[PDB]
Structures are given as structure tokens and as C-alpha cells.
PDB file of C-alpha atoms (C1' of nucleotides) in Angstrom:
ATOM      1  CA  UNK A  12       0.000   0.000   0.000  1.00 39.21           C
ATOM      2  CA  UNK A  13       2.540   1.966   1.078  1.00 40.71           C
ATOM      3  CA  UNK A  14       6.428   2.617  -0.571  1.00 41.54           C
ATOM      4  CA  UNK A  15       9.369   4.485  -0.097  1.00 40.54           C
ATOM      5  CA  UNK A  16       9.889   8.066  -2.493  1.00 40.71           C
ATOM      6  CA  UNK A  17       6.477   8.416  -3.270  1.00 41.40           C
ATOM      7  CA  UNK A  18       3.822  11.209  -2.210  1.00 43.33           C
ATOM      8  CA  UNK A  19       1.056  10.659   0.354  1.00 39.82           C
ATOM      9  CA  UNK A  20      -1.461  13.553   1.710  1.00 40.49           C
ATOM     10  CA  UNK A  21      -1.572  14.543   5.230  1.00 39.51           C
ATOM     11  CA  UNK A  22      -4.477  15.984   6.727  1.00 40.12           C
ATOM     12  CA  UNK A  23      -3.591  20.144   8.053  1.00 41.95           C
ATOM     13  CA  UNK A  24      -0.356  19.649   5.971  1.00 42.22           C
ATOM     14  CA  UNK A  25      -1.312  18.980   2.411  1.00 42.47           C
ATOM     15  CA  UNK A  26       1.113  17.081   0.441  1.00 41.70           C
ATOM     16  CA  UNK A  27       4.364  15.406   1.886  1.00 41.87           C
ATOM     17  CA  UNK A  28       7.385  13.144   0.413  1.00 39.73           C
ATOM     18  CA  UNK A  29       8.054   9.853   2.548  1.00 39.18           C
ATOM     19  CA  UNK A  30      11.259   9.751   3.291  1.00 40.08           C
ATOM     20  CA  UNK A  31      11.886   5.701   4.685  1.00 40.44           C
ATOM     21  CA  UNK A  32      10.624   3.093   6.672  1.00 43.74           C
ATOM     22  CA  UNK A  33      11.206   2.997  10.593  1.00 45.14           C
ATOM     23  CA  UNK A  34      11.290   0.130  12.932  1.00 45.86           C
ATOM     24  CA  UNK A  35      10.954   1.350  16.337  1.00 41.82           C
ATOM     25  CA  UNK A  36       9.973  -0.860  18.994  1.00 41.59           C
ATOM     26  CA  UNK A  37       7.464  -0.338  21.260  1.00 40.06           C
ATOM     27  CA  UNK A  38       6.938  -2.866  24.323  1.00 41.54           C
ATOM     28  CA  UNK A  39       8.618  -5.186  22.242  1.00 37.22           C
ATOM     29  CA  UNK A  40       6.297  -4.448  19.463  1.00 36.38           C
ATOM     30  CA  UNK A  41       7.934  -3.846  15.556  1.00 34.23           C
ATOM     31  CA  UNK A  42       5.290  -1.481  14.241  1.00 33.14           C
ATOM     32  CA  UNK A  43       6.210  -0.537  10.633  1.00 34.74           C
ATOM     33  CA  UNK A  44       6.646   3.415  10.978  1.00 31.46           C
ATOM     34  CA  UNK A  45       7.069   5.098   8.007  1.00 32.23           C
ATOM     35  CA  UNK A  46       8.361   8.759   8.318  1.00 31.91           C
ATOM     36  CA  UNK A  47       7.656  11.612   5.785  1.00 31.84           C
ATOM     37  CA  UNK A  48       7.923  15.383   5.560  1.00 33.77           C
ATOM     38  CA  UNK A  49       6.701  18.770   3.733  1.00 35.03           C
ATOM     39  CA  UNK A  50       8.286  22.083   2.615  1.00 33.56           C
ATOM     40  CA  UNK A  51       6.182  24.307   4.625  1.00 29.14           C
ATOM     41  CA  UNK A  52       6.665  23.946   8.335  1.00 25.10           C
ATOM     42  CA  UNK A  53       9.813  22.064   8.377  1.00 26.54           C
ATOM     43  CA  UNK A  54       8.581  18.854  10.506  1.00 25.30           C
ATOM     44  CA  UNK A  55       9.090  15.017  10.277  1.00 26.34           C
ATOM     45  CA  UNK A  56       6.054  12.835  10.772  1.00 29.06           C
ATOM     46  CA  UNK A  57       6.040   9.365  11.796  1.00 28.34           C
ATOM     47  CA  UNK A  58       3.257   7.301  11.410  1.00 27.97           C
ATOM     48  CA  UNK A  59       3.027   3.536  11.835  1.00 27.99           C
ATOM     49  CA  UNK A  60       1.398   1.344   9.022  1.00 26.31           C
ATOM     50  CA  UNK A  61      -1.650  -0.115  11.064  1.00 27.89           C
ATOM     51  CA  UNK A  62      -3.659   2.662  12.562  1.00 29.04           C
ATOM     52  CA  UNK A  63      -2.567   4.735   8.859  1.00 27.59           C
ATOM     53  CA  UNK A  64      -6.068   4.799   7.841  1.00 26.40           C
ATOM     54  CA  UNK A  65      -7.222   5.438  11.293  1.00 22.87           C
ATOM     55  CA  UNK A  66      -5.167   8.840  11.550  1.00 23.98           C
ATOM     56  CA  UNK A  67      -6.446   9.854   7.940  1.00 26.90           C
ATOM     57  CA  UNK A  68      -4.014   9.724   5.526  1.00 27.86           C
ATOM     58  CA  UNK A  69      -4.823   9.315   1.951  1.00 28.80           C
ATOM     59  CA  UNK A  70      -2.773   8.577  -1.689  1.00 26.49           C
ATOM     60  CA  UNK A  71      -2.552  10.453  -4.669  1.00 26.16           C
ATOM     61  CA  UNK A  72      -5.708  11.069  -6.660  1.00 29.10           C
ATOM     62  CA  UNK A  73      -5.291  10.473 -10.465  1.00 29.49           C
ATOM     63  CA  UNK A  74      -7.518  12.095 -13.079  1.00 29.03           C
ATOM     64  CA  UNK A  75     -10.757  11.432 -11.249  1.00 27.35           C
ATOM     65  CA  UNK A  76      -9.892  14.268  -8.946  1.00 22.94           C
ATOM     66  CA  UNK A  77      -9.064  17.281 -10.419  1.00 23.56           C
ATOM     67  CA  UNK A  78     -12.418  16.810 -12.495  1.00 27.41           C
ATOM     68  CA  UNK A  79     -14.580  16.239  -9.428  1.00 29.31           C
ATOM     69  CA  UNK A  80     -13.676  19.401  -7.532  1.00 26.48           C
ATOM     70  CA  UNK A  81     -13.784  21.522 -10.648  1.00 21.42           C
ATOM     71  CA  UNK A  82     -17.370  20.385 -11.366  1.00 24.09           C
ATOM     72  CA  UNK A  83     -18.636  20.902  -7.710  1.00 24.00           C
ATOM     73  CA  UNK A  84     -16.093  24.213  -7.657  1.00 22.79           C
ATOM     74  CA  UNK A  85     -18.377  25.258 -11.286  1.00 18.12           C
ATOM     75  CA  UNK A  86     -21.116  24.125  -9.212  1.00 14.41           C
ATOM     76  CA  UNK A  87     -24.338  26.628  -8.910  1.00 12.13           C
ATOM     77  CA  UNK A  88     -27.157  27.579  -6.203  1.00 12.65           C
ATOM     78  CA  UNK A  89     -25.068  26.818  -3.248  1.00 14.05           C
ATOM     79  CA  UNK A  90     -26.207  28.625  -0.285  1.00 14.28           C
ATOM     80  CA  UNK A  91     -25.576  29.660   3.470  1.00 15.53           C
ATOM     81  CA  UNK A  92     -27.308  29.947   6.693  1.00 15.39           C
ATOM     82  CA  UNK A  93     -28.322  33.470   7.524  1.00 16.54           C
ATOM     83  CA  UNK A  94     -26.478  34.218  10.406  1.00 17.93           C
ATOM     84  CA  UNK A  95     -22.573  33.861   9.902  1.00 17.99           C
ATOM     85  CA  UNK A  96     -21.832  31.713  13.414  1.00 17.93           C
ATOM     86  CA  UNK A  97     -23.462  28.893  11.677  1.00 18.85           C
ATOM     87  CA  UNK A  98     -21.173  28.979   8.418  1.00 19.83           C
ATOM     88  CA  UNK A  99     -18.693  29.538  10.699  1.00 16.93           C
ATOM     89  CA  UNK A 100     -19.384  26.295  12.383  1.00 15.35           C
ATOM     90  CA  UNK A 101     -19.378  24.334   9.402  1.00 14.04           C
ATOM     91  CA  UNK A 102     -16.407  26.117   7.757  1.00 13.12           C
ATOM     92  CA  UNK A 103     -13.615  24.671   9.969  1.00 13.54           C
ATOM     93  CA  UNK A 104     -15.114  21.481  10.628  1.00 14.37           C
ATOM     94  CA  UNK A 105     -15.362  20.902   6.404  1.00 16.30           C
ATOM     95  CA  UNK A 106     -11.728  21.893   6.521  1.00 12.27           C
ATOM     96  CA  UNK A 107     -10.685  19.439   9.268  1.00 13.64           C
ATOM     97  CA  UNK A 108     -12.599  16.854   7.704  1.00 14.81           C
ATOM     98  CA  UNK A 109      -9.865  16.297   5.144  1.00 15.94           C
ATOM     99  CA  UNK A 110     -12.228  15.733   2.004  1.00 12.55           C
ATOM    100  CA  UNK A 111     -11.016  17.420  -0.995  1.00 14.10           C
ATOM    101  CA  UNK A 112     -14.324  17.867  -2.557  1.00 14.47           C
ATOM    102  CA  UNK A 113     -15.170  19.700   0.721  1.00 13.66           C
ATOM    103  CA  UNK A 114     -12.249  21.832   1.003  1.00 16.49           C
ATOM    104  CA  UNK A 115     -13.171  23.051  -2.521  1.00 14.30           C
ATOM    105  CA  UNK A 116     -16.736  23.783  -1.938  1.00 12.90           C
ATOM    106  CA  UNK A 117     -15.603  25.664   1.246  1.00 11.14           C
ATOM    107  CA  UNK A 118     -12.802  27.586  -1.083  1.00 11.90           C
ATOM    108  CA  UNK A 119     -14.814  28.421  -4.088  1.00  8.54           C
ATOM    109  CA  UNK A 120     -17.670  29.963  -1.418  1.00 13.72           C
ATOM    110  CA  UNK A 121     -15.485  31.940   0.567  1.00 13.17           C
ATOM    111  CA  UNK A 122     -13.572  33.469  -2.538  1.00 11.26           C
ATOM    112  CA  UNK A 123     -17.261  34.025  -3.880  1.00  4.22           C
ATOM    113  CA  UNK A 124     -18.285  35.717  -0.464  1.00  6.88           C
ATOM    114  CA  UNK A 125     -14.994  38.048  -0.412  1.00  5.55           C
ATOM    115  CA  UNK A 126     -15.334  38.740  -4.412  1.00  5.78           C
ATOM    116  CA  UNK A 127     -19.002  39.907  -4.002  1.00  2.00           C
ATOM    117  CA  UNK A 128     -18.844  42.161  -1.025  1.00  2.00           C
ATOM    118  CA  UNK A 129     -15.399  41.438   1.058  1.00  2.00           C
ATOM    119  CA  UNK A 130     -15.984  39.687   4.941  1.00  2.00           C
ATOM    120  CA  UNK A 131     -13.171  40.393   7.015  1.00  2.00           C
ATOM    121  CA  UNK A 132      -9.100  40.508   7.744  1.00  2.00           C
ATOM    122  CA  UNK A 133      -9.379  37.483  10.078  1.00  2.00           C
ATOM    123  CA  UNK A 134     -11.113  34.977   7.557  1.00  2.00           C
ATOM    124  CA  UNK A 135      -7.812  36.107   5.064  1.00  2.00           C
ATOM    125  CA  UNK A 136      -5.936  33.966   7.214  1.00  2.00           C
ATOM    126  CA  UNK A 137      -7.936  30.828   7.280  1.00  2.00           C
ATOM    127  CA  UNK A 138      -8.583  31.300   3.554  1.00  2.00           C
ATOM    128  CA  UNK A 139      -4.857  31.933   2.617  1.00  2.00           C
ATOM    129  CA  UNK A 140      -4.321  28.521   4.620  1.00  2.00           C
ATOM    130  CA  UNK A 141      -6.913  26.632   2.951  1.00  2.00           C
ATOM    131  CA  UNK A 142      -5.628  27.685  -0.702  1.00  2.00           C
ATOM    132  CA  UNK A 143      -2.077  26.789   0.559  1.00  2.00           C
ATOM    133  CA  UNK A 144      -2.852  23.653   1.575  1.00  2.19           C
ATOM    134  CA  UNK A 145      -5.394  22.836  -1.377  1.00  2.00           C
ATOM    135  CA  UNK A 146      -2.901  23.852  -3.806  1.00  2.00           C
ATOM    136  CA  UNK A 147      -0.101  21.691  -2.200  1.00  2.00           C
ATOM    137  CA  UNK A 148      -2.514  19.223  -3.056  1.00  3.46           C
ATOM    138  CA  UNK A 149      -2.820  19.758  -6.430  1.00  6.54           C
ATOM    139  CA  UNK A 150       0.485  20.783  -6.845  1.00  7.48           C
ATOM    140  CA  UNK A 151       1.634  17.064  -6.227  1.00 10.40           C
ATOM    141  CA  UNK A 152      -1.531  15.263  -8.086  1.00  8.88           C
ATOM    142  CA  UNK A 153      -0.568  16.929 -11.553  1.00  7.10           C
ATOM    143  CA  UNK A 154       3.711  16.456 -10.912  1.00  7.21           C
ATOM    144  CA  UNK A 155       3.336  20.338 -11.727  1.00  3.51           C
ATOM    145  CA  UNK A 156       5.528  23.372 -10.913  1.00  4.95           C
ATOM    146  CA  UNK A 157       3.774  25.067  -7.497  1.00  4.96           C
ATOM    147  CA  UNK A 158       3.886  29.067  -9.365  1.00  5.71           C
ATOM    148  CA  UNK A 159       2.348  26.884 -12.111  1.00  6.79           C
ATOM    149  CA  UNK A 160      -0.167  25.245  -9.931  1.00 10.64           C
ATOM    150  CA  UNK A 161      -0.989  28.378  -8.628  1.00 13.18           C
ATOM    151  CA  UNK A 162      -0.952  29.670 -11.991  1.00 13.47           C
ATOM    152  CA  UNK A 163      -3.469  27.340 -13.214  1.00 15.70           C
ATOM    153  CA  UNK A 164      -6.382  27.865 -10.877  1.00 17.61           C
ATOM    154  CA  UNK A 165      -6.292  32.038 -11.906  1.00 16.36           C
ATOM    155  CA  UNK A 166      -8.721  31.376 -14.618  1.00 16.13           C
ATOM    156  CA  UNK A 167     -10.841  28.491 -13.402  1.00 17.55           C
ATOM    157  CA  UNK A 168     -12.446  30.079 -10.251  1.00 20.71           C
ATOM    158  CA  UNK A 169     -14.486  32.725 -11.851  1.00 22.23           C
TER     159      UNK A 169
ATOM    160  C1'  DC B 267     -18.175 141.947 -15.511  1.00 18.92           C
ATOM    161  C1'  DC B 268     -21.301 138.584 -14.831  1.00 20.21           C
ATOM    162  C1'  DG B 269     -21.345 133.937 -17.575  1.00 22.19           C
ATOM    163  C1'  DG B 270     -20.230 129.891 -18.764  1.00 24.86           C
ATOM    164  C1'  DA B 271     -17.337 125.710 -18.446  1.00 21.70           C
ATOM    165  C1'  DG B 272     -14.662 122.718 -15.816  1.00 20.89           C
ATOM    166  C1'  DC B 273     -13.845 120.983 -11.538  1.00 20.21           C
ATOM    167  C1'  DG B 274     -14.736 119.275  -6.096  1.00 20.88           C
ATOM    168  C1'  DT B 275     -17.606 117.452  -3.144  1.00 18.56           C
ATOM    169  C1'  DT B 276     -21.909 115.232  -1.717  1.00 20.65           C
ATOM    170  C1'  DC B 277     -25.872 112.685  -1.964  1.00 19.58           C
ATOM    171  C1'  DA B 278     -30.776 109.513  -3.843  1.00 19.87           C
ATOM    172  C1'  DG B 279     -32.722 106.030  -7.763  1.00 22.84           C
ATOM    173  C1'  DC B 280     -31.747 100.817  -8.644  1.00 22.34           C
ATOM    174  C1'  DG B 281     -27.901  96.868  -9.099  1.00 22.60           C
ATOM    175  C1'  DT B 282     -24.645  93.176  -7.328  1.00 24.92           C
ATOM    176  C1'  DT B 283     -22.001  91.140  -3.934  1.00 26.26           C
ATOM    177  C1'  DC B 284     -20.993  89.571   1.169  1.00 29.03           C
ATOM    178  C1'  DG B 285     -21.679  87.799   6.236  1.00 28.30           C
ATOM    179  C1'  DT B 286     -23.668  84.715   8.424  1.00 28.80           C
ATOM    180  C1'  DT B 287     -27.299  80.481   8.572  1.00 29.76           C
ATOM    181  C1'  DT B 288     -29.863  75.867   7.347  1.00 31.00           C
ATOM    182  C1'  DA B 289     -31.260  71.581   6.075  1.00 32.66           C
ATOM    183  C1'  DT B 290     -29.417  67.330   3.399  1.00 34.24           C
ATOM    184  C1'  DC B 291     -25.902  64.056   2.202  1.00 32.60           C
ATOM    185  C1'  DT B 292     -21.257  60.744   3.206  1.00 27.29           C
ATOM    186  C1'  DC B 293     -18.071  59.089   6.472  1.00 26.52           C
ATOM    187  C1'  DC B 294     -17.024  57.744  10.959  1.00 24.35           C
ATOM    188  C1'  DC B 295     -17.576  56.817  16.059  1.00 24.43           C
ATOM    189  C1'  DC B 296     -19.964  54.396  19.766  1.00 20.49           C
ATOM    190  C1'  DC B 297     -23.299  51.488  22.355  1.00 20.47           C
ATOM    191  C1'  DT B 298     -26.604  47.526  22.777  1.00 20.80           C
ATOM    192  C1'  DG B 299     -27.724  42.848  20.975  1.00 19.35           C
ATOM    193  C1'  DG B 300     -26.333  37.669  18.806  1.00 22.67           C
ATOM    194  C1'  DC B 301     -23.985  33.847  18.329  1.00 21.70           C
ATOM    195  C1'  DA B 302     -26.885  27.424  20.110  1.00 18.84           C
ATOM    196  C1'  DC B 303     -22.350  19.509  19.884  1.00 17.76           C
ATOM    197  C1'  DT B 304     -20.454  20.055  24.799  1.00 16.57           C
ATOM    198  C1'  DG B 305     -17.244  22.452  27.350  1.00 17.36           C
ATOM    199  C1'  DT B 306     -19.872  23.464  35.811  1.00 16.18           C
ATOM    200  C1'  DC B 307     -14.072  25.290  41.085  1.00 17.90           C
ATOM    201  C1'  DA B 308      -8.197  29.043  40.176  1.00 14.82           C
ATOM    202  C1'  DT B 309      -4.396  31.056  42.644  1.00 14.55           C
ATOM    203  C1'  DC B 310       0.260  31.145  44.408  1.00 13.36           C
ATOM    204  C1'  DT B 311       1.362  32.948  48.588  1.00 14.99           C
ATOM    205  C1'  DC B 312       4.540  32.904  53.128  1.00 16.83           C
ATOM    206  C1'  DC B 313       9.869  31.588  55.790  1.00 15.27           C
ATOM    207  C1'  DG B 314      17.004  33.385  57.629  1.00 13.09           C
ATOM    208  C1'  DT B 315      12.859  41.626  60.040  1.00 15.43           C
ATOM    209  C1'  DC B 316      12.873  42.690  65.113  1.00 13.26           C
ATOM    210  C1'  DA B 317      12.149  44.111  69.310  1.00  9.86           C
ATOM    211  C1'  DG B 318       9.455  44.520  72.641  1.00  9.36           C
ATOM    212  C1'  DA B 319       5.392  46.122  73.949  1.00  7.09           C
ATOM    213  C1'  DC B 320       0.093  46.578  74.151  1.00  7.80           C
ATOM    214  C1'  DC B 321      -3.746  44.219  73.971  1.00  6.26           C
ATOM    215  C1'  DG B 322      -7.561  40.999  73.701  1.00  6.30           C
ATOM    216  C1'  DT B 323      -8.272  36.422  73.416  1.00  7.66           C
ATOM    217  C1'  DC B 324      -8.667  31.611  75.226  1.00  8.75           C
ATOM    218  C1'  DG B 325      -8.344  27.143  77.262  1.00 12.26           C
ATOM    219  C1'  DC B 326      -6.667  25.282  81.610  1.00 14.25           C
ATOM    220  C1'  DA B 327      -7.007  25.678  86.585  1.00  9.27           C
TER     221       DA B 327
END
DNA sequence: CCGGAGCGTTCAGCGTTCGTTTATCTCCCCCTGGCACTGTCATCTCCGTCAGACCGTCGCA
């Protein structure tokens, strides 16, 4: 399921690069870790191959991806509770859920919100982090450049 | 030898321009009200005064 030098998602860290395979002990137990790392905050995690589904990480998505979210990003008459605590809510909890269709529904709304009116200068930084990390996504998924795959999404949002 | 013209000063007709106000239209400040998984007891003080008194307090006698 799992190799050495290939590219596995991470849940609040996007894509990461797997560097090799541990074999700690632990009470006498050899549980295969497996330790990887990304660009952005300069950390090493290690996560045994067991409880790897448990903790939520997930492969690389081939072409059935990048299709999906661009049909539910193109996707119309999505709508919002009223009052703003509620989206609020649901905002974060979409993003911790780790689902990339969700991640872009909860991107292309927000960018929507700020285009039409503008919300606020504390949402920036939850929406600069979700882009980050959604584009470190898709920067890995396509094998393209990151200023490209930053590039590339200019002209599909609108 | 006054008479007229030109000149100096001073006022009444209407004609425009100021001095000081007024309500309406943007931008901002400031106060009260809403948020709905649950989440139901903190906090470190204080020591090597100090010197003895003044005083009430308090359990034992």
C-alpha cells in the first residue's frame, strides 16, 4: 500500500514526500513506521502502518480528482445559513474533515463571499491557509511546478 | 463783468455682492444585541525583620 519516495497527503499539511521506513519498537512491538515530511513547516512525521487509515491519511488522486472538484467548484445555487456563526461552524469542521471535494466547496464559497462584497481581515488567514494547503494538493496530483499550480487555478475560479 | 465751463464734493434712484445660517448628504464613532455539539471550582502565597510592647483572646485551673 505503502512505498518508499512516493507522495502521500496529510491531513492540516497537504502534500508530503516519505522519506523511509522505521522500525521502532514499542513494548517489544515492531510497528512498521514510516516517516515523511513537507516544505512548509519544516517537521518530520512518523506514522506507523496499522492505525494509517485510522489517523487519515490518503494517496494520490489520479484524473478522477481534479475533475470532481472543478465540477462541484463550477457548481451553482449553493447557499448559506443566515447568520454567519453557523457557516462559521461548518467552515472549519469541512476543513478538518480532510475531504477534498469539501475543502473546494468551502474555497470556491469563501472566494465568492470576499469577491461579491469582502468579509473580514481574520477569515484572510484561514482562507490563505486553505488555498495553501489545497494547492499543495494539487500541486503534487498533476507532478506540476507550485507558481504553475498556482498559476493554473487564476482562470478556473471565476 | 457777470457767464459759462470745468472741476470738487456730496448725496438719492436701482444693481450686485458679502456675512452669516440651514437643512441634506457621506463618512465615521460608539453602544446595545447575537452567536446554540459540549465544554460546571483558580491562585500562588509565606519563611534566615525585630524588638518589645500593648492588647484581647482563650483554654486550663
Amino acid at each position: 500500500t505503502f512505498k518508499v519516495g512516493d507522495t502521500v497527503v496529510y491531513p492540516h499539511h497537504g502534500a508530503a514526500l516519505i522519506e523511509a521506513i522505521e522500525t521502532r519498537q514499542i513494548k517489544g512491538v515492531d510497528k512498521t513506521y514510516l516517516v515523511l515530511k513537507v516544505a512548509q513547516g519544516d517537521l518530520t512525521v512518523r506514522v506507523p502502518a496499522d492505525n494509517a487509515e485510522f489517523v487519515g491519511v490518503r494517496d494520490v488522486v489520479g484524473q478522477d480528482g481534479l475533475d470532481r472538484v472543478f465540477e462541484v467548484l463550477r457548481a451553482p445555487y449553493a447557499e448559506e445559513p443566515t447568520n454567519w456563526s453557523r457557516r462559521y461552524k461548518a467552515n472549519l469542521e469541512k476543513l478538518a474533515s480532510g475531504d477534498v471535494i469539501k475543502v473546494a466547496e468551502v474555497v470556491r464559497d469563501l472566494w465568492r463571499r470576499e469577491r461579491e462584497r469582502g468579509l473580514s481581515a481574520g477569515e484572510k488567514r484561514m482562507l490563505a491557509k486553505a488555498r495553501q494547503i489545497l494547492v499543495s494538493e494539487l500541486a503534487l496530483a498533476e507532478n506540476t511546478n507550485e507558481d504553475k499550480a498556482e498559476a493554473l487555478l487564476d482562470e478556473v475560479l471565476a
